[PDB]
Design a protein around this nucleic acid. Structure first.
Ligand SMILES: Nc1ncnc2c1ncn2[C@@H]1O[C@H](COP(=O)(O)OP(=O)(O)O)[C@@H](O)[C@H]1O
Lengths: 267, 601
DNA sequence: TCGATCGATCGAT
DNA sequence: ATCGATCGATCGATTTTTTTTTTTTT
């Protein structure tokens, strides 16, 4: 498209046009800094985005999924083009955000905060362990013995090597890509309570690049995005439909910082 | 259809309030004027005004409510559209009020539906927000899925046939979470009323519901005045069954008056820093310039009392300010400070403080030996309700930015008290054995209520042996001011002739000079000032302290000093002035020396 | 024992 | 003679909870 191409192109004319710190801007070199160490967790500044092009605040909330995807395509087509040897280790990228002009306390968010940009914090409690997931749709045809091909929703087209036939199928335990997974339980601090009552909480999902980072009993900072479980069994109802809530993780900052930590000025 | 009469009626209601509603003035557009920017979708209405102008739509409104209810949202829309460039985003929240009739749980039958009757009770076991994508889009799968329909029904139903085509009616299109309708509520239970206290039966429980803007402005421990919009609610019921089913009872309500839990902070209708924070300049100007204001203030809260006149000049200390200065990240700097009382048996030790809780807000008093050792900590639980260990509260910590004094300071176990040994200065408390690395904060002052050892003041022993407890605590209490008992008839006859003007039912008290409300508002104005120190006393307090300890050259040191400069910066807050002066110094020095020589044998 | 599946069948057109 | 609607034979899909023995804290 004409305008709907300009996003990645403005990222391209961003990471070698916007400058701070007396030349040799970070993201000219931060990306190769990270491709060296084989990390694949590049991070963005929002304030730098406001310094260069303030357009990217209204264009975002209408579907930030697509914003993040159109982000990651740029990191791919940059890195794997300029480091073509790289295409061995992970071959997938996404980016992070760590600058938001707002800290939304718990017990403050409602349906108005649906599917858009967030910041929130709190405390961890008990949650699950570490498990992997699926990533791709591939089956094995069972009438004719072929594979249907590569393709929260099912697809199942009639087109396939078996003369576009074989509604039936079966599945292997290999040749399909996987994805690490973990859950969390976010509870608010027992300092900033309404002074003596039960607290409130939500669940949160984090994804494969972000695991074995959190822990029970810790301090926290997350951007997150507000989810919507699309149906907890709509039917004859209670005095409420049985609906639920999660936030999906984009980027964490921990507050303890128990490692060698700060990024480096040029001088 | 039924409700077209209500349509026309609220139409002409609109058409009247379209003009004035009250004496060429309007009270039901300016809420809409404030609404006009964010469009939050609420406008409550008085039911009395229905009795004023529309001439008894109550029996038009008060029985067939639920079927008329949704037509009034369209009424609201037809209102808001008349003047603003309008989309159909407009919605109907309601917080009905001004209705005379206020009934209870027991006058409930199958004939009570679609009404607006009013009820109270108490709040228990409350429950959270719980969103609802009430709406969406749903039809066949060919192309024609844009469905702004009524799929918001209680029982929810995917199945819709079509709009444009003739297609499948069991294969749905997928759902819409993007450009649809979502809303917010919560859910609680409520117990039998304490304003209606019968015998016999249990506290019959009611289910009860609130809308979005009603949400999270209720709370545990409150008595209410609700709507009465009882509903049809979408084993053991072995009656007859039909079809061309066994229900329970439920209820909702859409109006709240969460009263008996309301003060409102500080906002002579005149000009000031803010709207009404100190609009009484006309008199506060005088209340900050009078020269006898100290004594006129002293005797302005204890007319029903007579004793010493030394804590009637001090204890304003506790309610008075501290510092609230602008510094770096060195550490917390503290503002308020302890006080102590000891005395002989019942010289009105307790009536000083039984009332002071009723005096200022946020500062509730009781004892902790009223309960377990759960004064400091919450109730230590070791059985499974949610995750087997829940201790995030207490009672002492329920006084944040306010005080919660005690009585019988002496006979309390040395667990809460040894915890107090730290909890008052480094005002951050911690525990283990059930703590998610427990990090709390109390902030506030205290008042003590000791009682001697034998119940007398025989000067045979030092004060620290007059009480004979553990020691270091008796410094951070920066002023004691003990009340003494003697045996003299003049005093006691003066007391009895206080009772002469306690029950002589006309003029059963003495005249006064300063009323309470003006006093309290002056006090709550006096804090927000950002005080200043630039005074030679600020230069020359070193010799005052050096002289203090020239007297102490014959316990000791600089905790008392911290107190000193805060006592006196408070007594200059009392002068409604910044810019510390060197006299509040001398008074504070005198108070210090009264305290220590009072401690002296 | 309950439910949709699918294939057949009977009037309309 | 073409085609849609209704009937009906054909197919597969559901049916696990109340005491105890250690454990931390008053
Ligand atoms: N100067 C005084 N002014 C008013 N009341 C006084 C004074 N001196 C003594 N009293 C009386 O002494 C009583 C003290 O009772 P109190 O100390 O509250 O009992 P307890 O010791 O159980 O708390 C008060 O009720 C009050 O009537």
């Amino acid at each position: 498209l004409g305008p709907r191409t300009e996003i990645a192109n403005r990222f391209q004319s961003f990471l070698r046009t916007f400058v701070d710190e007396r030349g040799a801007y970070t993201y000219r070199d931060r990306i190769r800094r990270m491709c060296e160490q084989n990390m694949s967790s590049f991070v963005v500044s929002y304030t730098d985005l406001a310094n260069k092009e303030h357009v990217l605040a209204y264009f975002l909330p209408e579907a930030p999924f697509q914003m993040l995807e159109i982000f990651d395509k740029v990191a791919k087509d940059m890195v794997l083009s300029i480091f073509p040897t790289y295409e061995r280790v992970t071959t997938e990228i996404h980016v992070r955000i760590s600058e938001l002009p707002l800290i939304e306390e718990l017990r403050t968010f409602r349906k108005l905060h649906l599917n858009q940009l967030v910041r929130t914090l709190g405390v961890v409690t008990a949650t699950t362990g570490v498990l992997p997931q699926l990533s791709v749709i591939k089956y094995d045809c069972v009438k004719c013995g072929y594979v249907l091909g590569p393709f929260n929703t099912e697809i199942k087209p009639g087109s396939c090597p078996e003369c576009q036939s074989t509604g039936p199928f079966s599945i292997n335990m290999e040749q399909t890509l996987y994805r690490n997974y973990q859950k969390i339980t976010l509870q608010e601090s027992p300092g900033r309570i309404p002074a003596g009552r039960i607290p409130r909480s939500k669940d949160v999902i984090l994804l494969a690049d972000l695991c074995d980072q959190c822990k029970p009993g810790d301090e926290l900072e997350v951007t997150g995005i507000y989810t919507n479980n699309y149906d907890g069994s709509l039917n004859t109802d209670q005095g409420f439909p049985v609906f639920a809530t999660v936030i999906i993780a984009n980027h964490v900052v921990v507050k303890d910082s128990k490692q060698v930590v700060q990024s480096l000025t040029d001088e | 259809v039924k409700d077209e009469v209500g349509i026309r009626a609220q139409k002409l209601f609109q058409d009247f309030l379209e003009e004035f509603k009250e004496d060429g003035e309007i009270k039901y557009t300016r809420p809409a004027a404030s609404l006009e920017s964010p469009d939050r979708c609420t406008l409550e209405v008085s039911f009395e005004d229905v009795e004023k102008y529309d001439q008894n739509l109550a029996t038009a409104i008060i029985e067939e409510y639920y079927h008329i209810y949704p037509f009034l949202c369209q009424s609201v829309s037809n209102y808001v559209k008349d003047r603003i460039g309008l989309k159909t985003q407009k919605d109907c929240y309601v917080a009905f009020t001004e209705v005379p009739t206020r009934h209870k749980v027991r006058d409930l039958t199958t004939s009570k539906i679609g009404t607006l009757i009013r009820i109270s009770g108490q709040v228990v076991r409350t429950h959270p927000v719980h969103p609802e994508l009430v709406s969406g889009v749903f039809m066949c799968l060919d192309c024609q899925t844009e469905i702004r329909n009524v799929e918001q029904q209680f029982k929810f139903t995917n199945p819709t046939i079509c709009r444009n085509p003739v297609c499948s009616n069991r294969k749905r299109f997928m759902l819409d979470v993007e450009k649809s309708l979502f809303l917010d509520f919560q859910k609680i239970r409520i117990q039998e009323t304490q304003a209606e206290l019968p015998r016999g039966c249990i506290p019959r429980a009611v289910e009860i519901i609130l809308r979005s803007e009603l949400v999270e402005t209720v709370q545990a421990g409150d008595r209410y005045d609700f709507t009465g919009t009882l509903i049809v609610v979408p084993l053991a019921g072995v009656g007859t069954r039909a079809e061309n089913l066994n229900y329970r009872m439920a209820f909702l309500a859409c109006s709240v008056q969460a009263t008996t839990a309301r003060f409102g902070g500080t906002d002579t209708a005149e000009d000031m820093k803010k709207q009404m924070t100190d609009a009484e300049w006309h008199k506060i100007y005088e209340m900050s310039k009078d020269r006898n204001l100290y004594q006129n203030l002293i005797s302005s809260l204890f007319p029903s009392i007579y004793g010493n006149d030394e804590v009637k000049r001090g204890i304003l200390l506790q309610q008075f300010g501290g510092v609230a200065k602008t510094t770096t990240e060195k550490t917390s700097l503290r503002g308020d400070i302890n006080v102590c009382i000891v005395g002989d048996p019942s010289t009105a030790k307790s009536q000083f403080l039984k009332q002071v809780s009723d005096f200022s807000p946020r500062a509730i008093y009781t004892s902790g030996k009223a309960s377990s050792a759960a004064g400091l900590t919450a109730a230590v639980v070791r059985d499974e309700e949610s995750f087997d260990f829940v201790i995030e509260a207490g009672a002492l910590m329920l006084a944040d930015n306010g005080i919660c004094c005690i009585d019988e300071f002496d006979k309390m176990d040395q667990r809460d008290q040894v915890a107090i040994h730290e909890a008052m200065e480094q005002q951050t408390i911690s525990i283990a054995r059930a703590g998610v690395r427990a990090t709390l904060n109390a902030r506030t002052s205290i008042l003590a209520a000791a009682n001697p050892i034998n119940g007398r003041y025989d000067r045979s022993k030092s004060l620290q042996q007059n009480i004979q407890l553990s020691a270091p605590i008796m410094s951070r209490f920066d002023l004691f001011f003990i009340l003494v008992d003697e045996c003299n008839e003049v005093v006691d006859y003066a007391i009895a002739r206080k009772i002469v003007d306690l029950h002589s039912n006309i003029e059963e008290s003495v005249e006064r000079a300063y009323t309470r409300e003006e006093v309290l508002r002056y006090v709550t104005f006096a804090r927000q000032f950002k005080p200043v120190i630039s005074q030679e006393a600020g230069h020359m307090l070193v010799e005052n302290y050096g002289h203090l300890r020239q007297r102490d050259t014959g316990r000791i040191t600089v905790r008392q000093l911290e107190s000193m400069i805060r006592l006196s910066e408070a007594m200059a807050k009392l002068e409604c002035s910044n810019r510390v002066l060197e006299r509040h110094v001398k008074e504070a020095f005198r108070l210090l020396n009264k305290s220590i020589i009072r401690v002296e044998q």
